[PDB]
Amino acid sequence: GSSGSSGAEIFTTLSCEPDIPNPPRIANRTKNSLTLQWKAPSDNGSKIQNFVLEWDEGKGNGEFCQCYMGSQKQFKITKLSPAMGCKFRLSARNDYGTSGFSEEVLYYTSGCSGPSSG
């Protein structure tokens, strides 16, 4: 932790791309499936049209491709394999355009598991 507080004197509105939304978390992952859930950022300027999710199809090369694009904030990617590291990224796009993409997140489908440190 570290001291952190903001507070700028009122100012005129801003008409530009929205702020980068937080990265999607895991709510349920299987050997052949992966469930991800994310929230909505701060709508500033214009209501966000839809969300644009991307992933490297769990290949491990570094090529992100449109996986899901819509309003919903939850998508379960089925037809996967166990022990397959796959990355993802969330981004909001409004009348203006798609805002910066969240921080690349790396996940690994269910699989091997051991005891808890104790």
Swiss-Prot record:
The modification N6-acetyllysine is found at K31. It comes from the Eukaryota. Coiled coil: none annotated. Residues 20-112 form the Fibronectin type-III domain. Expressed in the odontoblast and nerves in the dental pulp. Also expressed in trachea and to a lesser extent in the brain, liver, lung and kidney. Belongs to the FNDC3 family. Mediates spermatid-Sertoli adhesion during spermatogenesis. This is Fibronectin type-III domain-containing protein 3A. It comes from Homo sapiens.
